[PDB]
mmCIF file of C-alpha atoms (C1' of nucleotides) and ligand atoms in Angstrom:
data_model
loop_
_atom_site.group_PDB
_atom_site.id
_atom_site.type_symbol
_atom_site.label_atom_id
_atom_site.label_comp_id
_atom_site.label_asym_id
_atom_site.label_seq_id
_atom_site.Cartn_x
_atom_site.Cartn_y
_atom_site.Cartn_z
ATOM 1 C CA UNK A 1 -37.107 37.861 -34.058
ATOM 2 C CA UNK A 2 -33.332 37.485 -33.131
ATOM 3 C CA UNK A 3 -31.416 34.229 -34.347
ATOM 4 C CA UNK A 4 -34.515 32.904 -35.930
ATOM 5 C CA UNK A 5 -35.099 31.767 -39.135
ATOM 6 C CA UNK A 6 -37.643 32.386 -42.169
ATOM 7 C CA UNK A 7 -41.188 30.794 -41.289
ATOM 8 C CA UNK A 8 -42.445 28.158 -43.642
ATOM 9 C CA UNK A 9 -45.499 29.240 -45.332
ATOM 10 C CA UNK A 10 -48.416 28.351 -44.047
ATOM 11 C CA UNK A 11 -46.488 27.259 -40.427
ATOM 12 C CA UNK A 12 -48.177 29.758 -38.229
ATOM 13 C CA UNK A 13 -51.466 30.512 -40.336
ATOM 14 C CA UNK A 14 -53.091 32.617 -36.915
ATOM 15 C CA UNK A 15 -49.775 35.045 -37.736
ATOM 16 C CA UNK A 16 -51.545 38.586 -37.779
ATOM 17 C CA UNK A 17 -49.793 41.702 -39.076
ATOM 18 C CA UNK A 18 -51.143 45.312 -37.109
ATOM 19 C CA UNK A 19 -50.490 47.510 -40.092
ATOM 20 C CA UNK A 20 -50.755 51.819 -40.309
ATOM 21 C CA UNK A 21 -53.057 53.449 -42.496
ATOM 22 C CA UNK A 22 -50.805 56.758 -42.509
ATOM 23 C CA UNK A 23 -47.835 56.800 -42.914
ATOM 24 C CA UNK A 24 -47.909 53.061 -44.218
ATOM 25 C CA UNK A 25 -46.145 50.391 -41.814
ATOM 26 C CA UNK A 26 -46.167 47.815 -39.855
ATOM 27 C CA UNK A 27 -47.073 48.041 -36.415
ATOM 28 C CA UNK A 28 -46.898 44.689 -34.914
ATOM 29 C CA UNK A 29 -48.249 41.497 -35.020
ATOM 30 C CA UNK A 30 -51.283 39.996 -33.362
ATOM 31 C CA UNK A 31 -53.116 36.907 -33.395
ATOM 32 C CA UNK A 32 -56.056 35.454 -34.764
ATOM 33 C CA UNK A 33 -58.315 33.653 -32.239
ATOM 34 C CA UNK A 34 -61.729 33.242 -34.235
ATOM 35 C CA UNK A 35 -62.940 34.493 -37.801
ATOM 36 C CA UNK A 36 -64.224 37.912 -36.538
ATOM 37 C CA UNK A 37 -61.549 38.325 -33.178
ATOM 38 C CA UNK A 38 -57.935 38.765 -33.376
ATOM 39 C CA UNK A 39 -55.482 39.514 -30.008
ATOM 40 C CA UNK A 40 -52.472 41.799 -29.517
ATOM 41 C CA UNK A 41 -50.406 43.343 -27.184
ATOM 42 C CA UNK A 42 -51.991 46.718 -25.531
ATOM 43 C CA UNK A 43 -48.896 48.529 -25.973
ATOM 44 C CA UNK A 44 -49.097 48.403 -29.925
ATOM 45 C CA UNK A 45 -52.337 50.485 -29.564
ATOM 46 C CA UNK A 46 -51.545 52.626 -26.607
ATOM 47 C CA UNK A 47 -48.310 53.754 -25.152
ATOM 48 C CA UNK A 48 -48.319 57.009 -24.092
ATOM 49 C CA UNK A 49 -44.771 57.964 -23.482
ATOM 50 C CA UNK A 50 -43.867 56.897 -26.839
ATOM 51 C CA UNK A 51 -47.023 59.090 -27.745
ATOM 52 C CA UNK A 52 -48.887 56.056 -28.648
ATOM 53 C CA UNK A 53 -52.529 56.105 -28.744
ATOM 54 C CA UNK A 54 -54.194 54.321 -31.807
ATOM 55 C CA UNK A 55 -57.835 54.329 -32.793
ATOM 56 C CA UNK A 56 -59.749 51.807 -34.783
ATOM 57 C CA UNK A 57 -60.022 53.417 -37.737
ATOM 58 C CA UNK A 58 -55.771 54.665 -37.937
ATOM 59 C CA UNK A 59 -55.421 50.829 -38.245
ATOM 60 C CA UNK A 60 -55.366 47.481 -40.536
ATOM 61 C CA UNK A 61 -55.403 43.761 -39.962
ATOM 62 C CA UNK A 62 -53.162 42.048 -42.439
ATOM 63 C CA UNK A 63 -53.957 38.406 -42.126
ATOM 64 C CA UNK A 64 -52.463 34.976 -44.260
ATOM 65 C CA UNK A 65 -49.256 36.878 -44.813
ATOM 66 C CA UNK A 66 -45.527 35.866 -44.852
ATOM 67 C CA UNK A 67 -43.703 38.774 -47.051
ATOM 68 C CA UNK A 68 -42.967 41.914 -44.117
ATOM 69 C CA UNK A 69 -43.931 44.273 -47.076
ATOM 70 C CA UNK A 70 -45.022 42.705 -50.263
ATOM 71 C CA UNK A 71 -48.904 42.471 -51.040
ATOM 72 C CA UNK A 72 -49.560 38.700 -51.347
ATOM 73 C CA UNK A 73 -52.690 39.002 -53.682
ATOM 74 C CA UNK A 74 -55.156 36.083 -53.498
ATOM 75 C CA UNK A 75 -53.422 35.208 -50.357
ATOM 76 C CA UNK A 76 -53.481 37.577 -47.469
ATOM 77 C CA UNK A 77 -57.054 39.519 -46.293
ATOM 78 C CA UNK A 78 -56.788 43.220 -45.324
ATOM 79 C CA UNK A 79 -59.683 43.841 -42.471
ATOM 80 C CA UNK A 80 -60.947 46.890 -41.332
ATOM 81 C CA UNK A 81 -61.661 46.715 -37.370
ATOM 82 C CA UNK A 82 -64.738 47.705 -36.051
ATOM 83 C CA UNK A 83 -63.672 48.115 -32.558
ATOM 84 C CA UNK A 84 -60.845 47.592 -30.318
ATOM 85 C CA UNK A 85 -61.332 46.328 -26.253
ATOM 86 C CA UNK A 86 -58.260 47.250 -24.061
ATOM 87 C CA UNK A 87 -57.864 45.674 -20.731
ATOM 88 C CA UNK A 88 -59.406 48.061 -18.287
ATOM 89 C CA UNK A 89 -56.381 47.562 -15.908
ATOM 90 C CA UNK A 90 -53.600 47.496 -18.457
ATOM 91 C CA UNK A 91 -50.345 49.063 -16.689
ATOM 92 C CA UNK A 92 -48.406 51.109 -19.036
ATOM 93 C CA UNK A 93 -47.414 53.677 -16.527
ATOM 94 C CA UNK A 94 -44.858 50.387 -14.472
ATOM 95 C CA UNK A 95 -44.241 47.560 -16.021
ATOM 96 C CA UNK A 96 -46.798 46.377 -19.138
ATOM 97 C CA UNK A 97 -48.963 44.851 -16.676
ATOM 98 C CA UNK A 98 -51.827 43.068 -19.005
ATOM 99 C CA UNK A 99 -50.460 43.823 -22.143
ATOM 100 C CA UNK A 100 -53.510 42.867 -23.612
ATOM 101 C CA UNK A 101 -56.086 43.958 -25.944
ATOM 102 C CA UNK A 102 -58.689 42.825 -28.401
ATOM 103 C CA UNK A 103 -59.805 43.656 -32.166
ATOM 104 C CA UNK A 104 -63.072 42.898 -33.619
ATOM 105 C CA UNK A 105 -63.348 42.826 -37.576
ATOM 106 C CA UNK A 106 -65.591 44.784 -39.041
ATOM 107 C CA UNK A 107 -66.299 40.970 -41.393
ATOM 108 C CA UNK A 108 -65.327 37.753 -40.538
ATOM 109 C CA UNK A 109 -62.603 36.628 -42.330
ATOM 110 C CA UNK A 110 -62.720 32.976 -44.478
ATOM 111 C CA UNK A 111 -60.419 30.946 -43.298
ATOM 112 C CA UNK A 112 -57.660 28.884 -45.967
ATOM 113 C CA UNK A 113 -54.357 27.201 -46.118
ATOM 114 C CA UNK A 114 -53.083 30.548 -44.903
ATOM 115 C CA UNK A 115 -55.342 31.726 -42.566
ATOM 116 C CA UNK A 116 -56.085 29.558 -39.552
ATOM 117 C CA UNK A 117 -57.387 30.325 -35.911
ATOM 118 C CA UNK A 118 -55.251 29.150 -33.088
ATOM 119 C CA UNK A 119 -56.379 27.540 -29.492
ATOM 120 C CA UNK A 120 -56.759 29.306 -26.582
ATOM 121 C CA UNK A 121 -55.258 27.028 -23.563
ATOM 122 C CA UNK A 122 -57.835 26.518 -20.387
ATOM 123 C CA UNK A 123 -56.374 25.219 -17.046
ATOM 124 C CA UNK A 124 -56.065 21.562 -17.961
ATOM 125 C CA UNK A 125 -53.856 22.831 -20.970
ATOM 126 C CA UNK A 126 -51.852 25.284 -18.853
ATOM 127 C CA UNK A 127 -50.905 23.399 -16.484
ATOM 128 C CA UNK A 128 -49.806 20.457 -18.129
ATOM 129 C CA UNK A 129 -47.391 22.721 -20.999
ATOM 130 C CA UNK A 130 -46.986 26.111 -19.430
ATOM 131 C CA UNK A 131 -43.525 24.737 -17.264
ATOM 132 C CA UNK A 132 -40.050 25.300 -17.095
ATOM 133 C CA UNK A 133 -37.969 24.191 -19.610
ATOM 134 C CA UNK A 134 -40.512 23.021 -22.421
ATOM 135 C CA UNK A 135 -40.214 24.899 -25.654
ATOM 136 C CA UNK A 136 -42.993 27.454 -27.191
ATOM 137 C CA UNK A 137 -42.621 29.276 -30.373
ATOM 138 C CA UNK A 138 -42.748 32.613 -30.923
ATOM 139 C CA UNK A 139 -43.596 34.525 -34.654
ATOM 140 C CA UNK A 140 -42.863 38.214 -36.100
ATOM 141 C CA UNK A 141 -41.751 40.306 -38.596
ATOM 142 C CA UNK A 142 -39.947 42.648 -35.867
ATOM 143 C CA UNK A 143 -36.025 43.550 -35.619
ATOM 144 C CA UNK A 144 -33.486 40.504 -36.357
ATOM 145 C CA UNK A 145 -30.803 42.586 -33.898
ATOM 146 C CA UNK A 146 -31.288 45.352 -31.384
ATOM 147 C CA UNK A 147 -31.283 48.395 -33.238
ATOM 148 C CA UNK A 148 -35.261 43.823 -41.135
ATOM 149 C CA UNK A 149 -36.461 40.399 -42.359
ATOM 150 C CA UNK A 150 -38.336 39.855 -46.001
ATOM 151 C CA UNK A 151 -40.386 37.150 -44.340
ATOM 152 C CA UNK A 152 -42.096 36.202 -41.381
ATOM 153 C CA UNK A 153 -39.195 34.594 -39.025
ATOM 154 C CA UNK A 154 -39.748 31.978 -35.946
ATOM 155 C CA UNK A 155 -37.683 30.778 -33.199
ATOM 156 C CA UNK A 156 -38.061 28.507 -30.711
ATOM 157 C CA UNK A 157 -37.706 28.751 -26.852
ATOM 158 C CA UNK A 158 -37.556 27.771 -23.706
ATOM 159 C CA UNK A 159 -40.133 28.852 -20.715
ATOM 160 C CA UNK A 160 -37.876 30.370 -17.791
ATOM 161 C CA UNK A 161 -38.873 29.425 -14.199
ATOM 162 C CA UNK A 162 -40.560 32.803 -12.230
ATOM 163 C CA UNK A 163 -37.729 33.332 -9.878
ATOM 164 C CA UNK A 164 -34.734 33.645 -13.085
ATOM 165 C CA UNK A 165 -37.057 35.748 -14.866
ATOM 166 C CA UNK A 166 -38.012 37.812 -11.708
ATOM 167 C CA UNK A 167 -33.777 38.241 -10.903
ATOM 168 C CA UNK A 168 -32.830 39.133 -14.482
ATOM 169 C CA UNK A 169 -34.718 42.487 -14.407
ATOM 170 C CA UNK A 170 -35.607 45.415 -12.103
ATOM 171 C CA UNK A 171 -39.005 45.736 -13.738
ATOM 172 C CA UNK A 172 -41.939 44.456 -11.357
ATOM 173 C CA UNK A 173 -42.796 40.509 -12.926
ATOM 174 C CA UNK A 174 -46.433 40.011 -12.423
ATOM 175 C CA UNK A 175 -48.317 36.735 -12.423
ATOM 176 C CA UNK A 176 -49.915 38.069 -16.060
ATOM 177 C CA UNK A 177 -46.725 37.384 -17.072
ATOM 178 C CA UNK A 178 -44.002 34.601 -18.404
ATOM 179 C CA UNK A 179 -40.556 34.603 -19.472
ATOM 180 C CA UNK A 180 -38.966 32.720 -21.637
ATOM 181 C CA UNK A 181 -35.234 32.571 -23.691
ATOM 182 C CA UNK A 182 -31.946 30.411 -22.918
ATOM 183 C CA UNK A 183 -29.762 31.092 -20.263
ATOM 184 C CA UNK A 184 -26.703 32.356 -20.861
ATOM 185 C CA UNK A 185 -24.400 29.456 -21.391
ATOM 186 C CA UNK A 186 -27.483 26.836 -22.588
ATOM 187 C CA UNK A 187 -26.384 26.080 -25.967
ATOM 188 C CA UNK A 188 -28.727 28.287 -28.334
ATOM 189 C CA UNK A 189 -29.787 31.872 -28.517
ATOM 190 C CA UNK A 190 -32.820 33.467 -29.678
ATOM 191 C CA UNK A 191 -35.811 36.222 -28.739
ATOM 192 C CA UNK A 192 -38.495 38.404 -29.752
ATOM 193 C CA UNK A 193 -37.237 41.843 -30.749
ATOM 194 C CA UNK A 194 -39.000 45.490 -31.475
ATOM 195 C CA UNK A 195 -41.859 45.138 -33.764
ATOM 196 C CA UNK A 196 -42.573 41.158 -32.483
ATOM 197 C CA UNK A 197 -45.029 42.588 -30.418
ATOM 198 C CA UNK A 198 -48.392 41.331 -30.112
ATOM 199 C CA UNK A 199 -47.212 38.036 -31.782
ATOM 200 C CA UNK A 200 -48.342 34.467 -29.893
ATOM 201 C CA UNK A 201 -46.108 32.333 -28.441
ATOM 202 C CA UNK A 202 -47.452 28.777 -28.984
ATOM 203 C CA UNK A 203 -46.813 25.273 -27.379
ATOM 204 C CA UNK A 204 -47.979 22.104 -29.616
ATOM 205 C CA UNK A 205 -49.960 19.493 -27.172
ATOM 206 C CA UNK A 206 -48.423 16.394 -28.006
ATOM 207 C CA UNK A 207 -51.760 14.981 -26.378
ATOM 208 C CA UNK A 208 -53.899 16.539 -29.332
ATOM 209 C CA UNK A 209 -51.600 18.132 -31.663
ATOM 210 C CA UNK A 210 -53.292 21.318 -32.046
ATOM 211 C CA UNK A 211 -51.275 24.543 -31.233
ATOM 212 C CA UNK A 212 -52.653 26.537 -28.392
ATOM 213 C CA UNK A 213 -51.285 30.578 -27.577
ATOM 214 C CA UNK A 214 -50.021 30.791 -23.835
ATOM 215 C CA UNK A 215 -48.209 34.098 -24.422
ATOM 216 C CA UNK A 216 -48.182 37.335 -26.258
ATOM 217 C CA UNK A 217 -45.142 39.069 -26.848
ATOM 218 C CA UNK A 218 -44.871 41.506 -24.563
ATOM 219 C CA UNK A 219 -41.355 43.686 -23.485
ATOM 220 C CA UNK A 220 -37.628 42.753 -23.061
ATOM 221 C CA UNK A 221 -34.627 45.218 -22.447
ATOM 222 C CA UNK A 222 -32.785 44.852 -26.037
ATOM 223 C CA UNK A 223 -33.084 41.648 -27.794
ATOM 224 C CA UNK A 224 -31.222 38.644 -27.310
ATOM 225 C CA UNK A 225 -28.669 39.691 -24.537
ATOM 226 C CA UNK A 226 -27.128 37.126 -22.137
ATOM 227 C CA UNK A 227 -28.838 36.782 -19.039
ATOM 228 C CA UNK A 228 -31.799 38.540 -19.903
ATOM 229 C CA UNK A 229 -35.387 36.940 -21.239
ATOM 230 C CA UNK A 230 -38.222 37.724 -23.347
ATOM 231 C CA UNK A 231 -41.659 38.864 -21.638
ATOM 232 C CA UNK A 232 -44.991 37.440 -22.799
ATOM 233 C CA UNK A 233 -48.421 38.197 -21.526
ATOM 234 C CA UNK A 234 -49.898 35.061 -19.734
ATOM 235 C CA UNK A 235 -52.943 34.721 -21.811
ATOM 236 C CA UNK A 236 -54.434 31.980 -19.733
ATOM 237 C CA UNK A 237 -54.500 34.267 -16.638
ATOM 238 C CA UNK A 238 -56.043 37.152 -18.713
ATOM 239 C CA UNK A 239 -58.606 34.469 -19.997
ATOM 240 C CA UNK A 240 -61.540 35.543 -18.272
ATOM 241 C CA UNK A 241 -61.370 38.861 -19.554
ATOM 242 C CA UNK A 242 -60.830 37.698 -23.166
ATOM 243 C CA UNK A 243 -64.186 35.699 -22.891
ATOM 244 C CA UNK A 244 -66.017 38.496 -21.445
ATOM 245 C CA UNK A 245 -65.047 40.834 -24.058
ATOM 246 C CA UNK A 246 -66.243 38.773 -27.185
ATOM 247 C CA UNK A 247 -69.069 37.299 -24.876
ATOM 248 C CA UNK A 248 -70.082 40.455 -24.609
ATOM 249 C CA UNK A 249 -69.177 42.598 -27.945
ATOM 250 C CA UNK B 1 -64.073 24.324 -33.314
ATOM 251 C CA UNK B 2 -60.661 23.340 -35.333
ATOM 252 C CA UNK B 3 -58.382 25.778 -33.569
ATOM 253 C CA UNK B 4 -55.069 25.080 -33.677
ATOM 254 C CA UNK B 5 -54.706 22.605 -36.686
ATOM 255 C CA UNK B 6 -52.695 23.740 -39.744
ATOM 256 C CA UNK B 7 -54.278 23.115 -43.255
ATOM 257 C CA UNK B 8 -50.506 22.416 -44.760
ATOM 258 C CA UNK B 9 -49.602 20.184 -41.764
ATOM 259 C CA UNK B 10 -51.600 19.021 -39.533
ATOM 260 C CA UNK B 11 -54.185 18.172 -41.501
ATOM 261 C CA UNK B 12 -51.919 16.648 -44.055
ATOM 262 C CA UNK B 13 -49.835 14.487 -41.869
ATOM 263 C CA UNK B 14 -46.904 16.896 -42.098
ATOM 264 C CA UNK B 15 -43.874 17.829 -39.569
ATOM 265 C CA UNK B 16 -43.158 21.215 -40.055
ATOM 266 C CA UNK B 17 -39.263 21.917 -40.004
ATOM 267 C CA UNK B 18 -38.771 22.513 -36.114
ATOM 268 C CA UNK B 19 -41.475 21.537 -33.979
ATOM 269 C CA UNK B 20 -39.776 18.315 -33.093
ATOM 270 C CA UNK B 21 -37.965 20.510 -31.131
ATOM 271 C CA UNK B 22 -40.919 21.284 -29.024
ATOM 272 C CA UNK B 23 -41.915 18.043 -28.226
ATOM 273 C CA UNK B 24 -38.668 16.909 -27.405
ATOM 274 C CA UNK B 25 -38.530 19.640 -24.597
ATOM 275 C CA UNK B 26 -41.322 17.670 -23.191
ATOM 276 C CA UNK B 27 -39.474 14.372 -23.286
ATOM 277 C CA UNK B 28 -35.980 14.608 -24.420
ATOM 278 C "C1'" DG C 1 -45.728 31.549 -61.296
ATOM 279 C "C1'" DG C 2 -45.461 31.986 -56.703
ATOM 280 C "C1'" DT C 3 -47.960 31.141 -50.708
ATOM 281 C "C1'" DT C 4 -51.941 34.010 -56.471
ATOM 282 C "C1'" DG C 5 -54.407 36.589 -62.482
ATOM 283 C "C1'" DG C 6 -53.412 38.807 -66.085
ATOM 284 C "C1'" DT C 7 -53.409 43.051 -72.935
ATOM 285 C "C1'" DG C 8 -48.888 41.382 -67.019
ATOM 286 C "C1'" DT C 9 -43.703 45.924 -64.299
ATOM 287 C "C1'" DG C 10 -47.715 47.760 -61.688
ATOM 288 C "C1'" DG C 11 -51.184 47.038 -58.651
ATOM 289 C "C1'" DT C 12 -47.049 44.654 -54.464
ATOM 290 C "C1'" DG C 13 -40.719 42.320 -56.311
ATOM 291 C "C1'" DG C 14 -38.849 40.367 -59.556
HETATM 292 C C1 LIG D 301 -44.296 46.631 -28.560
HETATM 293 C C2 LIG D 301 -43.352 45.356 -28.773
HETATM 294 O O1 LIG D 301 -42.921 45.260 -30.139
HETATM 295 C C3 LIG D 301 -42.081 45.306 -27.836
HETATM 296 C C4 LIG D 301 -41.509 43.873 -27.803
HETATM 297 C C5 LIG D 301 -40.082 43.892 -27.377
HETATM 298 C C6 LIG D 301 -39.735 42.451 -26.968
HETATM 299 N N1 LIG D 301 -38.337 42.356 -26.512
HETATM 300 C C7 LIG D 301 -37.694 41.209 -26.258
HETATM 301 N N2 LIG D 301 -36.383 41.267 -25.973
HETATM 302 N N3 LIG D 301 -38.345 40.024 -26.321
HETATM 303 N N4 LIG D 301 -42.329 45.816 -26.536
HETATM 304 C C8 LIG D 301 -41.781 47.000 -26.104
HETATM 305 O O2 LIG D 301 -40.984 47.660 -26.770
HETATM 306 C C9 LIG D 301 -42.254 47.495 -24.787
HETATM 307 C C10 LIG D 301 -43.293 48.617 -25.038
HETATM 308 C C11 LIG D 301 -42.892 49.745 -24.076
HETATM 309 C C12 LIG D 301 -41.429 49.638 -23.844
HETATM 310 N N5 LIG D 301 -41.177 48.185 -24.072
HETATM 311 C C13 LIG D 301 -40.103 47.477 -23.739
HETATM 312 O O3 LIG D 301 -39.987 46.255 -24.030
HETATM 313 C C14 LIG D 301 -38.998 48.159 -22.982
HETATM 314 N N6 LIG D 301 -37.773 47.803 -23.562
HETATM 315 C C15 LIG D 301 -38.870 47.761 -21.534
HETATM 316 C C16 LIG D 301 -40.037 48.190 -20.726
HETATM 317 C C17 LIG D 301 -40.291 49.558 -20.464
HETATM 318 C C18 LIG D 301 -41.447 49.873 -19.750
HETATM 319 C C19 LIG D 301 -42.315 49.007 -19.201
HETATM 320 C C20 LIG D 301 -41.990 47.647 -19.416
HETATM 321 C C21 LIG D 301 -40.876 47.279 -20.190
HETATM 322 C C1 LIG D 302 -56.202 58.350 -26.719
HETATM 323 O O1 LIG D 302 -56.877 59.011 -27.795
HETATM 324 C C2 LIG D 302 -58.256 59.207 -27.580
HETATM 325 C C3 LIG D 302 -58.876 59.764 -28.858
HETATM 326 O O2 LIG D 302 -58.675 58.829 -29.911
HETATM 327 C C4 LIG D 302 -58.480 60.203 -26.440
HETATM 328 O O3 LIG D 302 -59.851 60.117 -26.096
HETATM 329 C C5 LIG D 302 -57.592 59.959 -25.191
HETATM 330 O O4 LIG D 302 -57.207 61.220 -24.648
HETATM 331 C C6 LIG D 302 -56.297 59.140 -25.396
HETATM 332 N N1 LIG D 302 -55.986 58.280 -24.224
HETATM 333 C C7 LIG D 302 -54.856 58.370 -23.502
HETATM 334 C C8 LIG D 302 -54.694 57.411 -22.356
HETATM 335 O O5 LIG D 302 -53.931 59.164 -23.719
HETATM 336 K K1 LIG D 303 -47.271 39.591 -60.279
HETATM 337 NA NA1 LIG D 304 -31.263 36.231 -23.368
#
DNA sequence: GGTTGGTGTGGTGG
């Protein structure tokens, strides 16, 4: 997270770090959606031109955390995943397209001041928040410059209308997509960066004050340049195949 | 069931730092 | 202690 600042604790208690078994690391972040489920970005598990291609079993859950690195005893839960669902028609190859995927715990986690489930928006909620110029909030431990923090850092920003977003890049947009950032001359600054990925972006409904995830960090070209915008997977449009998965599984 | 409601603030009747920033976005 | 114990500097910082 560029031009952020350090997350109160307990302020985003669905905050999920991906972690390595070997060599020991952070991967990215992730979200957690229900005590047993917990959503990412597909790219953190499976990119092959980085050679990219994570299993189950190469990977943690880190879960109630705010140190990047220190082990919070009595505080954060370290699942094992049983499985993990990637969307069947995730695009790596062009552009990201449904850069989405699922984990199941192997046990469901309890929740606690730290650890907390966040909403999943349906059409009504969508609709009504997912608009130009209101404000989301995005969550990570990733790169504070293109190229870092001790805790877990938030920002706040701005949803970009589709046809700024689709201008400030040569990368196909899709509708599984949003963008979101300041333009160049708004007044503030601020993105996701490297290692954000997988992390929600969440809107607060001032209708019921819970916090619902409309994005998942996604891709950007560097972090925080002018006239460029985060990426975020539309996680309402890829809602059908979320409930399928743990419907299913 | 809960989704979405923070133990330290929502549930306690407290703002965190910045999210009167987001619903300001919504209505200045 | 702390966002948390205790033959308490490591197990994970100081
Ligand atoms: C995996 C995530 O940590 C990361 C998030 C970067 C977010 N950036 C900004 N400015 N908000 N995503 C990536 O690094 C993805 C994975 C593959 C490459 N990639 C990129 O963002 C590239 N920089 C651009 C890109 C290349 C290929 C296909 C789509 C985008
Ligand atoms: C990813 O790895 C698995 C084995 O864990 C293997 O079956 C497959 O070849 C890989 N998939 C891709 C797309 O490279
Ligand atoms: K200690
Ligand atoms: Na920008």
């Amino acid at each position: 997270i560029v031009e952020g600042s350090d997350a109160e604790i307990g302020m985003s208690p669905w905050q999920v770090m991906l972690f390595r078994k070997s060599p020991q690391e952070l991967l990215c972040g992730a979200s957690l959606i229900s005590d047993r489920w917990v959503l990412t970005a597909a790219h953190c598990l499976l990119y092959p031109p980085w050679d990219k291609n994570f299993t189950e079993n190469d990977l943690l859950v880190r879960i109630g955390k705010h140190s990047r690195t220190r082990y919070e005893r009595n505080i954060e839960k370290i699942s094992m995943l049983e499985k993990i669902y990637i969307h069947p028609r995730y695009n790596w190859r062009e552009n990201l397209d449904r850069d989405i995927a699922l984990m199941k715990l192997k046990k469901p986690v309890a929740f606690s001041d730290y650890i907390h489930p966040v909403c999943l928006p349906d059409r009504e909620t969508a609709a009504s928040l997912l608009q130009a110029g209101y404000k989301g909030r995005v969550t990570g431990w990733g790169n504070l410059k293109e190229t870092q923090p001790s805790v877990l850092q938030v920002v706040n920003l701005p949803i970009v209308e589709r046809p700024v977003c689709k201008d400030s890049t040569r990368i196909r947009i899709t509708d599984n997509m949003f963008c979101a950032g300041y333009k160049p001359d708004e007044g503030k600054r601020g993105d996701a960066c490297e290692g954000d990925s997988g992390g929600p972006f969440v809107m607060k409904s001032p209708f019921n004050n819970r916090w619902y995830q409309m994005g998942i960090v996604s891709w950007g070209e560097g972090c925080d340049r002018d006239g460029k915008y985060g990426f975020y997977t539309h996680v309402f449009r890829l809602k059908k195949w979320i409930q399928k998965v743990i419907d299913q599984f | 069931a809960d989704c979405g409601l923070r133990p330290l603030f929502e549930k306690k009747s407290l703002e965190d730092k910045t999210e009167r920033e987001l619903l300001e976005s919504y209505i200045d």
